[PDB]
Amino acid sequence: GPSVFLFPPKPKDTLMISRTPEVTCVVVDVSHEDPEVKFNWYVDGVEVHNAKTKPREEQYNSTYRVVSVLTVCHQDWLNGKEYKCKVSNKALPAPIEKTISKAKGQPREPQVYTLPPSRDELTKNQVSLTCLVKGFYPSDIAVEWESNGQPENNYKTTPPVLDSDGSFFLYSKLTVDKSRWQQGNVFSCSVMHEALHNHYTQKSLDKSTGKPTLYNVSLIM
Amino acid sequence: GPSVFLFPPKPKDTLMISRTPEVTCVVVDVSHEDPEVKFNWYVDGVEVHNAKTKPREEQYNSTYRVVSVLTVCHQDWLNGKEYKCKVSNKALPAPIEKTISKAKGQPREPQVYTLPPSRDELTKNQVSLTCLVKGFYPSDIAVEWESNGQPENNYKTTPPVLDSDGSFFLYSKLTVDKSRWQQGNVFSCSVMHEALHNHYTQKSLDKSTGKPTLYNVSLIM
Amino acid sequence: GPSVFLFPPKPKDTLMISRTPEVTCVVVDVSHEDPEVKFNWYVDGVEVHNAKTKPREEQYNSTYRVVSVLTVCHQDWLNGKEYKCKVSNKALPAPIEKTISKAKGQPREPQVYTLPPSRDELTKNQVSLTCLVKGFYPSDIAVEWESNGQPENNYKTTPPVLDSDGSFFLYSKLTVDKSRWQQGNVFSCSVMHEALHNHYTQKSLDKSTGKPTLYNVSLIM
Ligand SMILES: *[C@@H]1O[C@H](CO)[C@@H](O)[C@H](O)[C@H]1NC(C)=O
Numbered sequence: 001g002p003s004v005f006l007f008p009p010k011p012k013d014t015l016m017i018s019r020t021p022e023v024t025c026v027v028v029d030v031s032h033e034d035p036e037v038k039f040n041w042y043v044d045g046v047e048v049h050n051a052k053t054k055p056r057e058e059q060y061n062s063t064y065r066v067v068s069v070l071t072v073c074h075q076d077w078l079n080g081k082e083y084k085c086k087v088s089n090k091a092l093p094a095p096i097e098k099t100i101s102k103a104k105g106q107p108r109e110p111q112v113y114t115l116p117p118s119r120d121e122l123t124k125n126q127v128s129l130t131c132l133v134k135g136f137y138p139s140d141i142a143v144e145w146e147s148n149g150q151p152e153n154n155y156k157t158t159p160p161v162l163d164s165d166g167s168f169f170l171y172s173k174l175t176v177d178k179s180r181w182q183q184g185n186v187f188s189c190s191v192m193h194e195a196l197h198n199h200y201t202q203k204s205l206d207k208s209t210g211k212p213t214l215y216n217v218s219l220i221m
Numbered sequence: 222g223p224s225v226f227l228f229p230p231k232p233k234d235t236l237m238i239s240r241t242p243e244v245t246c247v248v249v250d251v252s253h254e255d256p257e258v259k260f261n262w263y264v265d266g267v268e269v270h271n272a273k274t275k276p277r278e279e280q281y282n283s284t285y286r287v288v289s290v291l292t293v294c295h296q297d298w299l300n301g302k303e304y305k306c307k308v309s310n311k312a313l314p315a316p317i318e319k320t321i322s323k324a325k326g327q328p329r330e331p332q333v334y335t336l337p338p339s340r341d342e343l344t345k346n347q348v349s350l351t352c353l354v355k356g357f358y359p360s361d362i363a364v365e366w367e368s369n370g371q372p373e374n375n376y377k378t379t380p381p382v383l384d385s386d387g388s389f390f391l392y393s394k395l396t397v398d399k400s401r402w403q404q405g406n407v408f409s410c411s412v413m414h415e416a417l418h419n420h421y422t423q424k425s426l427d428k429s430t431g432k433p434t435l436y437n438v439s440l441i442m
Numbered sequence: 443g444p445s446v447f448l449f450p451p452k453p454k455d456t457l458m459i460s461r462t463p464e465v466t467c468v469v470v471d472v473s474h475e476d477p478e479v480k481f482n483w484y485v486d487g488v489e490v491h492n493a494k495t496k497p498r499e500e501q502y503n504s505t506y507r508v509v510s511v512l513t514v515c516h517q518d519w520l521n522g523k524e525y526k527c528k529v530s531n532k533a534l535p536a537p538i539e540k541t542i543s544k545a546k547g548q549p550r551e552p553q554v555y556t557l558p559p560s561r562d563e564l565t566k567n568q569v570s571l572t573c574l575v576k577g578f579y580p581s582d583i584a585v586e587w588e589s590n591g592q593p594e595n596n597y598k599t600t601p602p603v604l605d606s607d608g609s610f611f612l613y614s615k616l617t618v619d620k621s622r623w624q625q626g627n628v629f630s631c632s633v634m635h636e637a638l639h640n641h642y643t644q645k646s647l648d649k650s651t652g653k654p655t656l657y658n659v660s661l662i663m
């Protein structure tokens with residue numbers, strides 16, 4: 001009857017400290033005649049019952065969106081511990097189990113190059129800052145933006161694209177007020193990837209990124 | 222029960238006169254006992270005979286795949302003509318009428334900007350050239366790289382991504398060797414979208430464009 | 443009789459995800475008459491028996507010095523959760539309970555400024571890079587040196603010093619060869635602090651960071 005959908009945690013809440021990691025073993029299409037879904041967890045074999053019991057959520061099509069969330073510590077998740085999720089349901093003929101861990105494979109150091117806007121874009125009242133993050137592995141990666149140590153929110157991030165060499169790459173455009181950009185403000189693009197040292201790196205740009213030694217040869221007629 | 226997958230025309234072919242759109246209805250999962258299938262084309266309810274049928278190929282799973290392509294006028298697709306492929310077979314109780322047409326989404330023109338590689342990437346053996354396309358609507362765009370008219374092959378392109386203004390945007394990275402880059406080869410990225418004037422535009426770069434040094438001329442009065 | 447010194451994890455380990463933090467429960471002046479040691483740990487009163495105990499060793503003073511390493515996850519120490527170590531020694535009148543936790547107080551975001559080497563440094567073969575870090579709170583902070591994504595080891599860091607306004611400040615001197623610094627090799631300062639956004643900040647520092655040399659040419663014909 002009911003099916004099971006397993007979701008690995010996002011890179012954001014497992015690659016950095018102040019957001020806890022949590023694996024999302026979800027059960028779907030649980031009908032009204034068997035609302036009980038039992039949550040059992042294994043992390044590299046040892047049974048753990050510290051998961052939080054999210055109560056059942058009804059659905060429009062008379063099913064159940066019941067979610068099992070397992071609290072994790074970051075280091076062991078980085079070690080690829082397998083999450084055996086044991087779920088037993090009355091309409092389920094047997095206890096259905098699913099497994100997931102860290103996406104294995106040789107990690108690649110994500111080279112981060114932050115590119116300035118093109119000169120022709122400076123005509124428009126809004127300006128775009130781009131952050132190429134290329135040559136990484138796996139696709140688990142997050143990119144944010146910040147200026148003066150405070151995050152920005154008018155940015156978007158394109159999904160990763162497979163590269164020829166077996167790596168991946170992605171871009172992220174931060175659109176800000178052009179007035180804030182011409183004032184010499186500094187913008188820094190943050191990259192959180194497992195291969196990085198301390199699982200974090202940063203690069204920055206300013207208005208005066210490409211510039212000689214201030215040869216301000218100005219002609220007035 | 223055989224099913225039909227309908228191919229919309231590629232945006233590049235619809236928006237380029239030299240190329241041509243190919244609306245195609247694809248018939249799959251046809252048992253070998255009854256591979257006789259006929260297609261009835263109705264362009265706004267008009268039976269048309271121009272359809273061409275390619276040779277059929279057997280699938281690995283002991284089913285058959287008989288295909289029929291249809292070259293079409295550019296204005297007919299650009300004006301949202303209703304396209305119907307009526308699939309008839311002895312193994313289907315009812316004909317399949319899948320209709321395909323272009324959307325009426327108010328098209329907003331893009332604003333192509335392309336950026337030279339960052340100074341950090343100049344050290345690596347290969348540089349990356351990005352052709353950002355921003356602000357367009359709808360999401361049908363093909364981006365092509367080339368140098369001196371020869372279309373470059375080794376390049377990738379991110380899928381269109383929604384923005385905060387309701388439009389779309391995308392990038393495209395070209396894997397060009399650093400040795401070819403430093404000689405100043407001129408590379409041009411091509412943007413093909415229906416909202417453009419003539420439905421085509423391009424931007425070309427060189428080391429001179431976006432050079433790290435810039436004599437700040439400030440020709441003012 | 444025997445005494446107990448309790449030590450917190452080093453700021454680097456608790457401040458970055460790459461390493462592990464340990465709360466140390468040292469027992470000193472442990473006589474050979476009753477070498478019995480018992481290690482208990484309360485995490486907000488929650489007993490945990492995951493601790494690792496190193497074997498005993500002999501000092502100059504005819505006693506052992508055993509320790510109790512306790513491996514914890516970073517968010518728990520960063521949450522201010524209380525920790526306690528109980529050691530039951532027969533000679534002492536009662537087993538001694540010692541508590542430890544995060545140094546509380548309103549967090550202050552560190553401000554990072556990089557100062558290029560003085561004009562007197564180019565005479566010597568090894569210039570000094572200074573990463574001023576000031577105006578933060580509390581004194582748990584790690585500073586590392588990175589060049590093109592790789593750490594440097596020829597660096598030192600002053601302990602935090604009380605400032606005028608109650609905050610702390612510390613510097614860090616990275617010694618590089620004058621050839622590398624004069625080659626335009628990029629250098630940046632990494633700061634691990636609990637009050638920073640994503641617990642990380644970086645500041646670029648180069649020859650181009652200095653050398654403003656306003657070359658202001660004008661022509662008013
Ligand atoms: C350079 O000249 C321009 C044009 O006169 C002026 O606006 C600008 O302030 C000058 N900058 C410097 C650093 O002298």
Ligand SMILES: *[C@@H]1O[C@H](CO)[C@@H](O)[C@H](O)[C@H]1NC(C)=O
Binds near residue numbers: 208216437439440441
């Ligand atoms: C470069 O020239 C432009 C155009 O006049 C001017 O606005 C800008 O301030 C100049 N840059 C510097 C650093 O002076």
Ligand SMILES: *[C@@H]1O[C@H](CO)[C@@H](O)[C@H](O)[C@H]1NC(C)=O
Binds near residue numbers: 218656658659660661
């Ligand atoms: C540079 O010179 C320009 C005119 O050439 C002047 O407007 C500007 O104020 C100067 N900037 C300085 C001296 O910083």
